[PDB]
Design a protein around this motif. Structure first.
Motif, PDB file in Angstrom:
ATOM      1  N   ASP A  63       0.829  -1.176   0.000  1.00  0.00           N
ATOM      2  CA  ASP A  63       0.000   0.000   0.000  1.00  0.00           C
ATOM      3  C   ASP A  63       0.889   1.262   0.000  1.00  0.00           C
ATOM      4  O   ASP A  63       0.794   2.127   0.858  1.00  0.00           O
ATOM      5  CB  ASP A  63      -0.964  -0.061   1.199  1.00  0.00           C
TER       6      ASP A  63
ATOM      7  N   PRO B 190     -13.585   0.872  -6.411  1.00  0.00           N
ATOM      8  CA  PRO B 190     -12.820   1.287  -5.232  1.00  0.00           C
ATOM      9  C   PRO B 190     -12.158   2.636  -5.373  1.00  0.00           C
ATOM     10  O   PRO B 190     -11.535   2.905  -6.410  1.00  0.00           O
ATOM     11  CB  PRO B 190     -11.741   0.196  -5.120  1.00  0.00           C
ATOM     12  N   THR B 191     -12.306   3.476  -4.348  1.00  0.00           N
ATOM     13  CA  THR B 191     -11.734   4.826  -4.313  1.00  0.00           C
ATOM     14  C   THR B 191     -10.293   4.832  -3.789  1.00  0.00           C
ATOM     15  O   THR B 191      -9.827   3.874  -3.199  1.00  0.00           O
ATOM     16  CB  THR B 191     -12.576   5.713  -3.392  1.00  0.00           C
ATOM     17  N   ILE B 192      -9.577   5.923  -4.010  1.00  0.00           N
ATOM     18  CA  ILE B 192      -8.193   6.023  -3.549  1.00  0.00           C
ATOM     19  C   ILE B 192      -8.180   6.921  -2.332  1.00  0.00           C
ATOM     20  O   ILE B 192      -9.054   7.729  -2.160  1.00  0.00           O
ATOM     21  CB  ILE B 192      -7.284   6.540  -4.665  1.00  0.00           C
ATOM     22  N   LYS B 193      -7.187   6.792  -1.477  1.00  0.00           N
ATOM     23  CA  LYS B 193      -7.274   7.470  -0.190  1.00  0.00           C
ATOM     24  C   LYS B 193      -6.670   8.867  -0.230  1.00  0.00           C
ATOM     25  O   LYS B 193      -7.065   9.709   0.554  1.00  0.00           O
ATOM     26  CB  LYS B 193      -6.745   6.584   0.958  1.00  0.00           C
TER      27      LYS B 193
ATOM     28  N   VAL C  52      -1.735   7.160  -6.346  1.00  0.00           N
ATOM     29  CA  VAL C  52      -2.265   5.800  -6.239  1.00  0.00           C
ATOM     30  C   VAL C  52      -1.190   4.802  -5.738  1.00  0.00           C
ATOM     31  O   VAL C  52      -0.045   4.831  -6.203  1.00  0.00           O
ATOM     32  CB  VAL C  52      -2.628   5.133  -7.606  1.00  0.00           C
ATOM     33  N   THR C  53      -1.609   3.860  -4.894  1.00  0.00           N
ATOM     34  CA  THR C  53      -0.745   2.800  -4.416  1.00  0.00           C
ATOM     35  C   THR C  53      -0.916   1.509  -5.240  1.00  0.00           C
ATOM     36  O   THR C  53      -1.912   1.300  -5.963  1.00  0.00           O
ATOM     37  CB  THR C  53      -1.039   2.486  -2.926  1.00  0.00           C
TER      38      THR C  53
ATOM     39  N   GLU D 187      -4.084  -0.266  -4.368  1.00  0.00           N
ATOM     40  CA  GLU D 187      -5.230   0.422  -5.000  1.00  0.00           C
ATOM     41  C   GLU D 187      -5.362   0.117  -6.522  1.00  0.00           C
ATOM     42  O   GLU D 187      -6.464  -0.065  -7.050  1.00  0.00           O
ATOM     43  CB  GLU D 187      -5.158   1.955  -4.742  1.00  0.00           C
ATOM     44  N   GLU D 188      -4.240   0.050  -7.225  1.00  0.00           N
ATOM     45  CA  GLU D 188      -4.262  -0.231  -8.675  1.00  0.00           C
ATOM     46  C   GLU D 188      -4.823  -1.622  -8.910  1.00  0.00           C
ATOM     47  O   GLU D 188      -5.650  -1.826  -9.844  1.00  0.00           O
ATOM     48  CB  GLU D 188      -2.866  -0.132  -9.282  1.00  0.00           C
TER      49      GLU D 188
ATOM     50  N   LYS E 231      -6.887  -3.418  -6.916  1.00  0.00           N
ATOM     51  CA  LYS E 231      -8.330  -3.450  -6.629  1.00  0.00           C
ATOM     52  C   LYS E 231      -9.182  -2.827  -7.745  1.00  0.00           C
ATOM     53  O   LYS E 231     -10.225  -3.359  -8.109  1.00  0.00           O
ATOM     54  CB  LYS E 231      -8.649  -2.720  -5.317  1.00  0.00           C
TER      55      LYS E 231
END
Ligand SMILES: CCCCCCCCCCCCCCCCCC(=O)OC[C@H](COP(=O)([O-])OCC(O)COP(=O)([O-])OC[C@@H](COC(=O)CCCCCCCCCCCCCCCCC)OC(=O)CCCCCCCCCCCCCCCCC)OC(=O)CCCCCCCCCCCCCCCCC
Ligand code: BCL
Ligand code: BCL
Ligand code: BCL
Ligand SMILES: CC[C@H]1c2cc3[nH]c4c(c3C)C(=O)[C@H](C(=O)OC)c4c3nc(cc4[nH]c(cc(n2)[C@@H]1C)c(C(C)=O)c4C)[C@@H](C)[C@@H]3CCC(=O)OC/C=C(\C)CCC[C@H](C)CCC[C@H](C)CCCC(C)C
Ligand SMILES: CC[C@H]1c2cc3[nH]c4c(c3C)C(=O)[C@H](C(=O)OC)c4c3nc(cc4[nH]c(cc(n2)[C@@H]1C)c(C(C)=O)c4C)[C@@H](C)[C@@H]3CCC(=O)OC/C=C(\C)CCC[C@H](C)CCC[C@H](C)CCCC(C)C
Ligand SMILES: COC1=C(OC)C(=O)C(C/C=C(\C)CC/C=C(\C)CC/C=C(\C)CC/C=C(\C)CC/C=C(\C)CC/C=C(\C)CC/C=C(\C)CC/C=C(\C)CC/C=C(\C)CCC=C(C)C)=C(C)C1=O
Ligand SMILES: COC1=C(OC)C(=O)C(C/C=C(\C)CC/C=C(\C)CC/C=C(\C)CC/C=C(\C)CC/C=C(\C)CC/C=C(\C)CC/C=C(\C)CC/C=C(\C)CC/C=C(\C)CCC=C(C)C)=C(C)C1=O
Ligand SMILES: CCCCCCCCCCCC[N+](C)(C)[O-]
Ligand SMILES: CCCCCCCCCCCC[N+](C)(C)[O-]
Ligand SMILES: CCCCCCCCCCCC[N+](C)(C)[O-]
Ligand SMILES: CCCCCCCCCCCC[N+](C)(C)[O-]
Ligand SMILES: CCCCCCCCCCCC[N+](C)(C)[O-]
Ligand SMILES: [Fe+3]
Lengths: 302, 241, 281
Positions: B110, B208-211, B216-217, B220-221, B223
């Motif tokens: 992450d 899915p949203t990014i934090k 982007v992590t 995240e990519e 998901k």
């Protein structure tokens, strides 16, 4: 239909990239070239910069001398007429010295002397280019894999033009410089040695050349199929396996019963290709030094 | 007997050692083999596991040693459909939300991928100095359409790979003012619109949203890409012609 | 048994025929309807090759050979002993290859990936069909096809080539070779490059793709990039096979004389055809 990712739909551009530094001497890099929109549809658009030190200048200088040595000979066979030059281009030929002269450098220019001059220049151009693939890797702290693989290609060329002629005792056994003439030589070599389809090394070399096309079709198609999960980012997929690498492995496991990793497919790759010129050079070396006729040899040795 | 037969026989022995070396290197991930319940299978094959190697990662990010202990590090919402080995495992809830089948992701780190100089590899173009569209149709401003032929939103930026100078995602704004990322490999840019075959208009909010809004992590990519590829199978009901 | 990460991907669905009837695995292998079809076609093919071997009188794999019907049969059926077995095995082989491609498509659907692999494979199938179906039909006899045997098929390559002199002089064959040699060059470079970044000098950190672009710009002034090199390998490899099929579809049909003689078109252009000197004057 789905987008296939063979050509890019949108191009994006930023400031010219001067590259990583590490231990490279920056005084020897050129400036950046222009950007090509044409190339950018398929890969990167940036041309340059290029590194050019002592060993690159040497390689280029001798590379051009080899070219111009062949070129003036062709012009002279054309009687200096440029119509004849374009008409008979594929038919002109610079031939090695006759058997009479053996391994000596005593032959006249018109009858083998120029062939030797051209081969001298090619020899320095290639070996200095080899040194430069080693050194450019070292300046960046990388492994020497590119230089070792290039050495396998150099082996076949060395055997054809230098080592096999030395061992037979004459320069007349080497390959002429000419487009059609070097095809005739290849055909003639097989006839004289009893049909090269019976040379087991020739058969192996063909297995690896076919297999290289099989393997790059497999690998290239696989990475494009998982590019929707970032699959072409191979180095980070090595360090931290993602769903791209897992789906690529399972396609092949479900199809044929076994699979690779993201690092490991690159070991299959370098070896499949390198074994083409490695086995081929051995098959040529043995022809006429140890075995005169492959048909005959095959009858006595399973 | 003769030197050519000595050579061909030596070569076959070399080639057997090379295949052995190559197969064991390709066992550094995914082994040992398992039964369907996660315990070690009895028959691992004739090749043994290789001795471990260690990669040193750049930018202070540590090391990786493989082979090493394997685990999924996440729940898997699946159940058996037969009383013996070799059959499919059915989703127990919604497979798009649960992340199984063609919607699967992996638990990568992450953190974002870094470049040669230690900076984030992927950025929105608005924060990437001197970057611009040099050829093709610029998508920014275009409406986005789903496989049900309904409008899900509009494009508000391109996310670019700085080192490799490449478009990697489109950032899309939804009916409620929030955004999501879409992979460039799963869209079709046209004169008057962007088209998305894998998803219907109602499935866009579940991406899915990014934090953080400017990076982007790797987790995240995975998901995001897993979820949009999953609609090819699981959205098919609403896809049409 | 399964790979440590595999169970989450083994879900139902993606099949093209049969619904859930054949949606299962045997060990690592996915089956499907097209798994059943390839087994049937393969097994029937192998039995017929065996029967061919009894009628010939060897079990030696270096001598077994199944020959096509002789030229006098043209394009009709032949007796089993004299070409019929070759006709039936060719039907089985085609059925096995097409079935293997369609099984790959079912696997793609279950995994949610692109269709690039079976698409590439279909080029190989095409090259096979050019030699055993398309060229023989255009020429008017099955007898122009190649026989099935380890050494006898090389004989066919040799006799077919030398029917038109030195086959090097076929221009489509020249292009096909360039692509084969260029594809092997590119495959060596790609594998070396990635490995040289994952495995640097002892004690150093892993390199980055930025190091890979830099290496190639320093060396030749250009780098095609990590997406580009995978596109390139796919293209060189398929182009090699496309020009191979083309170089044979024209031989014996539009062109049937010595290939060296074709190049007389170039040398006889009226501008230079009569100027003295050179090699051809
Ligand atoms: C007659 C027939 C006989 C045929 C024999 C053919 C000869 C084969 C050559 C073998 C080369 C092995 C090189 C090596 O040490 O590998 C290290 C390599 C480490 O790679 P890495 O992990 O990437 O390390 C990177 C580090 O950063 C380290 O980074 P690096 O930057 O140092 O690069 C490492 C590596 C990277 O290179 C490669 O992996 C590919 C290399 C391609 C080599 C092509 C050479 C062409 C030679 C032409 C001359 C032909 C002469 C023939 C006569 O390159 C080298 O190891 C140096 C090679 C120099 C050889 C020059 C010889 C001069 C003469 O590991 C291997 O690849 C091991 C290979 C194992 C082969 C199988 C063994 C079979 C044994 C059979 C007997 C058993 C019987 C059981 C049944
Ligand atoms: C392509 C142009 C010519 C031709 C020209 C040549 C020449 C020239 C040579 C070969 C060689 C080979 N050819 Mg041939 N070959 C042709 C068509 C074929 C076909 C086909 C059905 O279309 C097949 C199956 C083969 C098979 C073979 C192998 C026996 C051998 C090594 C190939 C290789 O490694 O490839 C790359 C593939 C891989 C590395 C993957 C592995 C494939 C394995 C090895 C194939 C085994 C096939 C098996 C023996 C036959 C099936 C048995 C059962 C019935 C299933 N050829 C056409 C007619 N071929 C070489 C040889 O040594 O011949 C004696 C050689 O010098
Ligand atoms: C009628 C002719 C004979 C025959 C005669 C020969 C002979 C003779 C030889 C081969 C060789 C080969 N043959 Mg055979 N061959 C026949 C039939 C076949 C058939 C077939 C389907 O029938 C096939 C597929 C092959 C296939 C092959 C290859 C596997 C192998 C060449 C490898 C390679 O990459 O070389 C290409 C790579 C190189 C030449 C290395 C180049 C390296 C140097 C360093 C590059 C310098 C570049 C320079 C500086 C830049 C200049 C730019 C230019 C102007 C463009 N042959 C028939 C039976 N064949 C070779 C071999 O290995 O045999 C064992 C060989 O010597
Ligand atoms: C003396 C002979 C002549 C000559 C006559 C011919 C003839 C005749 C032919 C070629 C053809 C070719 N020649 Mg030539 N050729 C000569 C000299 C050369 C030289 C050289 C260095 O001198 C080279 C490099 C080549 C190169 C080539 C290639 C361009 C081409 C072969 C590849 C191909 O078609 O693949 C295509 C690939 C296939 C057909 C493979 C298909 C595989 C199938 C789909 C699946 C197999 C499955 C298998 C059964 C599985 C078994 C599974 C196991 C159970 C695991 N030739 C000399 C001058 N050449 C051939 C060609 O272009 O054919 C179209 C051809 O017919
Ligand atoms: C594993 C076997 C395969 C292989 C591998 C291989 N080849 C290699 C390598 C490797 C691993 C390299 O690293 C090396 C390379 O650098 O590749 C980029 C190379 C190489 N393989 C090459 C060619 C090549 N390889 C071949 C084959 C193969 N190489 C095999 C199939 C073949 C054939 C015949 O099939 C060829 C023709 C070269 C591209 C390159 C080596 C370069 C070299 O030695 O160059 C010497 C230098 C010169 C000849 C200089 C003159 C060239 C130009 C005339 C200069 C142009 C500039 C000029 C000033 C023009 C100005 C114009 C302006 C006004 C615009
Ligand atoms: C188009 C670029 C290249 C290419 C690509 C390619 N090949 C592929 C694929 C791709 C993308 C696959 O996905 C597929 C695969 O699964 O690879 C692992 C395949 C494949 N390429 C293969 C082989 C192969 N490919 C070759 C060539 C090429 N493949 C090209 C150079 C060659 C040669 C001669 O150059 C061969 C030998 C197989 C390993 C595999 C396909 C497996 C398959 O179809 O299995 C189903 C069939 C059987 C299990 C057996 C059928 C038995 C028959 C009924 C009887 C035998 C009759 C036969 C005609 C006799 C031949 C006798 C010979 C001595 C002449
Ligand atoms: C980026 O990532 C990648 C991977 O992983 C991460 C990969 O793995 C691969 C795959 C590549 C490799 C593993 C490298 C090695 C591969 C080769 C050198 C290619 C040549 C392959 C072979 C010669 C093997 C051929 C084997 C075959 C075709 C299978 C034989 C099949 C049987 C005996 C059984 C038949 C099965 C049937 C009929 C289906 C139904 C079964 C029943 C029992 C019914 C690639 C390309 C890749 O790019
Ligand atoms: C991690 O990833 C990677 C990258 O990313 C970071 C990379 O950058 C690179 C680096 C790659 C490059 C710098 C590009 C590599 C380029 C090549 C290997 C050359 C490819 C060749 C072309 C682009 C040219 C196209 C094809 C050719 C020239 C073959 C076809 C030839 C002909 C048609 C002509 C034949 C000649 C004659 C005389 C025939 C006569 C016939 C008639 C007259 C008729 C690699 C390797 C990589 O791995
Ligand atoms: C293999 C492809 C060949 C590409 C060669 C391009 C070399 C670019 C050299 C940089 C240009 C130097 N310049 C013009 C700025 O002076
Ligand atoms: C001693 C032989 C060395 C190998 C050389 C093989 C001949 C190369 C064929 C190309 C001839 C030169 N030219 C100008 C046409 O490119
Ligand atoms: C690194 C991959 C290894 C692939 C092995 C390919 C084996 C090909 C067998 C061809 C037989 C050659 N023969 C009989 C002439 O020697
Ligand atoms: C000469 C080519 C023969 C290649 C055979 C390769 C097939 C390997 C499949 C093994 C996996 C199946 N199993 C049951 C062992 O797990
Ligand atoms: C020329 C390549 C064909 C030979 C490769 C043989 C590999 C068989 C490996 C079996 C894989 C082990 N398994 C299925 C248990 O994971
Ligand atoms: Fe790759």
């Amino acid at each position: 239909a789905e987008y296939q990712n063979i050509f890019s739909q949108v191009q994006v551009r930023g400031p010219a990239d001067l590259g990583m530094t590490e231990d490279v001497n920056l005084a020897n890099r050129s400036g950046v070239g222009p950007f090509s929109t044409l190339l950018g549809w398929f890969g990167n658009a940036q041309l340059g910069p290029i590194y050019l030190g002592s060993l690159g200048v040497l390689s280029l200088f001798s590379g051009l001398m080899w070219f111009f040595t062949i070129g003036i000979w062709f012009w002279y066979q054309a009687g200096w007429n440029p119509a004849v030059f374009l008409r008979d281009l594929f038919f002109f030929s610079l031939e090695p010295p006759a058997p009479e002269y053996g391994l000596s450098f005593a032959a006249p220019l018109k009858e083998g002397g120029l062939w030797l001059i051209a081969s001298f220049f090619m020899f320095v151009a290639v070996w200095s280019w080899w040194g430069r693939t080693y050194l450019r890797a070292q300046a960046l702290g990388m492994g020497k894999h590119t230089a070792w693989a290039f050495l396998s290609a150099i082996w076949l060329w060395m055997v054809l033009g230098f080592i096999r002629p030395i061992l037979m005792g004459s320069w007349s056994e080497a390959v002429p410089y000419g487009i059609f003439s070097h095809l005739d030589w290849t055909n003639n070599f097989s006839l004289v040695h009893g049909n090269l389809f019976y040379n087991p090394f020739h058969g192996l070399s063909i297995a690896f050349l076919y297999g290289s096309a099989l393997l790059f079709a497999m690998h290239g198609a696989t990475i494009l199929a998982v590019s929707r999960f970032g699959g072409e980012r191979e180095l980070e997929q090595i360090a931290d396996r993602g769903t791209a690498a897992e789906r690529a492995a399972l396609f092949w496991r479900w199809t044929m019963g076994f699979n690779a990793t993201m690092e490991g497919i690159h070991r299959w790759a370098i070896w499949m290709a390198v074994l083409v010129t490695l086995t081929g050079g051995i098959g040529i070396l043995l022809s006429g030094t140890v075995v005169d006729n492959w048909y005959v040899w095959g009858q006595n040795h399973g | 007997f003769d030197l050519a037969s000595l050579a061909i026989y030596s070569f076959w022995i070399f080639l057997a050692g090379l295949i052995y070396y190559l197969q064991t290197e390709n066992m550094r991930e995914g082994y040992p083999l398992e039964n369907e319940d996660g315990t070690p299978a009895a028959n691992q094959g004739p090749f043994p596991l290789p001795k471990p190697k260690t990669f040193i990662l750049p930018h202070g990010r540590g090391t990786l040693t493989v082979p090493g202990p394997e685990s999924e590090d996440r729940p898997i919402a699946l159940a058996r459909t037969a009383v013996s080995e070799g059959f499919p495992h059915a989703p127990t809830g919604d497979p798009m939300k649960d992340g199984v089948g063609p919607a699967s992701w992996v638990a990568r780190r992450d953190l974002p991928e870094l470049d040669g100089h230690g900076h984030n590899k992927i950025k929105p173009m608005k924060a990437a100095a001197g970057f611009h569209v040099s050829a093709g149709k610029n998508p920014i401003g275009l409406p986005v359409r789903g496989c049900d032929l309904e409008i899900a939103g509009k494009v508000v930026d391109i996310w670019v790979d700085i080192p490799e100078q490449m478009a990697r995602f489109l950032e899309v704004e939804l009916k409620d003012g929030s955004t999501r990322l879409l992979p460039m490999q799963m869209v079709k840019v046209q004169s008057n619109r962007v088209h998305v075959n894998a998803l219907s208009s109602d499935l866009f909010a579940g991406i899915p949203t990014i934090k953080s809004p400017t990076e982007v992590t790797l987790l995240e990519e995975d998901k995001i890409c897993g979820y949009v590829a999953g609609g090819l199978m699981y959205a098919a009901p609403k896809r049409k012609s | 048994a399964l790979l440590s990460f595999e169970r989450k991907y083994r879900v139902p669905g993606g099949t093209l025929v049969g619904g859930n009837l054949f949606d299962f695995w045997v060990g690592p292998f996915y089956v499907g309807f097209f798994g059943v079809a390839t087994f049937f076609f393969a097994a029937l093919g192998i039995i017929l090759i065996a029967w061919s071997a009894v009628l010939q009188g060897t079990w030696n794999p270096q001598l077994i050979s199944v020959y096509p019907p002789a030229l006098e049969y043209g394009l009709g059926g032949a007796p089993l002993a004299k070409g019929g077995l070759w006709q039936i095995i060719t039907i089985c082989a085609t059925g096995a290859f097409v079935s293997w491609a369609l099984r790959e498509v079912e696997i793609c659907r279950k995994l949610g990936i692109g269709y690039h692999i079976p698409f590439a494979f279909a080029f190989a199938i095409l090259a096979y069909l050019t030699l055993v179906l398309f060229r023989p039909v255009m020429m008017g006899a099955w007898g122009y096809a190649f026989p099935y045997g380890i050494w006898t098929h090389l004989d066919w390559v040799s006799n077919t080539g030398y029917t038109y002199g030195n086959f090097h002089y076929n221009p489509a064959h020249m292009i096909a070779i360039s692509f084969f040699f260029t594809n092997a060059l590119a495959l060596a470079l790609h594998g070396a490059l990635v490995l040289s970044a994952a495995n640097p000098e002892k004690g150093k950190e892993m390199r980055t793709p930025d190091h890979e672009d830099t290496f190639f710009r320093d060396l030749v002034g250009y780098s095609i990039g990590t997406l580009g090199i995978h596109r390139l390998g796919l293209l060189l490899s398929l182009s090699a096979v496309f020009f191979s099929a083309l170089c044979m579809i024209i031989t014996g049909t539009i062109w049937f004389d010595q290939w060296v003689d074709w190049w007389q078109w170039w040398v006889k252009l009226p501008w230079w055809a009569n100027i003295p000197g050179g090699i051809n004057g």
